[PDB]
């Protein structure tokens, strides 16, 4: 349930929250928000396990 | 098992040269994002093509 963004185009200003998350594009092979090549999602989960 | 480790050098590196003549299946470089691999100034890359 706890997640953390892993991809973005620009960095953040100090104390900046941004929620808008489409399928990130890792350079070329345009993602068009259609999850093509180089398309990883910024949403990443942790391994919070006992 | 007999993969060649060869030094190629005395020239200029590149990254976008792989988007015109090679129809890709996978394109992964870990430890450094492939994007900067054009400007990256390598020191006698031990080329392993197989």
Sign of the CA dihedral with A43 first, then A28, A30, and A17 last: positive
Question: Resolution of the deposited coordinates, in angstroms?
Answer: 3.7
Burial class (CB in 10 A: 0-12, 13-18, 19+), B16: exposed
Chain B residues with CB-CB distance to A6 below 8 A: none
Q: C-alpha angle A16/A27/B50, rounded to 5°?
A: 135
Q: Which residues of B touch A37 (CB under 8 A)?
A: 24
Q: Tell me the C-alpha distance between A7 and A41, whole Å.
A: 7
Q: How far is A38 from chain B (nearest CA, A)?
A: 9
Cα–Cα distance, B5 to B2 (Å, whole number): 9
- Tokens describing residue A44: 């990443």
Structure tokens at A26: 């890792």
How many CB pairs below 8 A link A and B? Answer: 5
Cβ of B19 within 8 Å of Cβ of A28? The answer is yes
Q: Which residues of B touch A8 (CB under 8 A)?
A: none
In DSSP notation, A4-35 reads: EE---SS---SS--------EE-SSS--TTS-
Integer Cα distance of B2 and B11 in angstroms: 26
């Amino acid at each position: 349930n706890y997640l953390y963004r892993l991809f973005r185009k620009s960095n953040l200003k100090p104390f900046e929250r941004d929620i808008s998350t489409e399928i990130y594009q890792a350079g070329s092979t345009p993602c068009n928000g259609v999850e093509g090549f180089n398309c990883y999602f910024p949403l990443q989960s942790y391994g919070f396990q006992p | 098992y007999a993969w060649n480790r060869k030094r190629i050098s005395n020239c200029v590196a590149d990254y976008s040269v792989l988007y015109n003549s090679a129809s890709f299946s996978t394109f992964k470089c870990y430890g450094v994002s492939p994007t900067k691999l054009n400007d990256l100034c390598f020191t006698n890359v031990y080329a392993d093509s197989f």
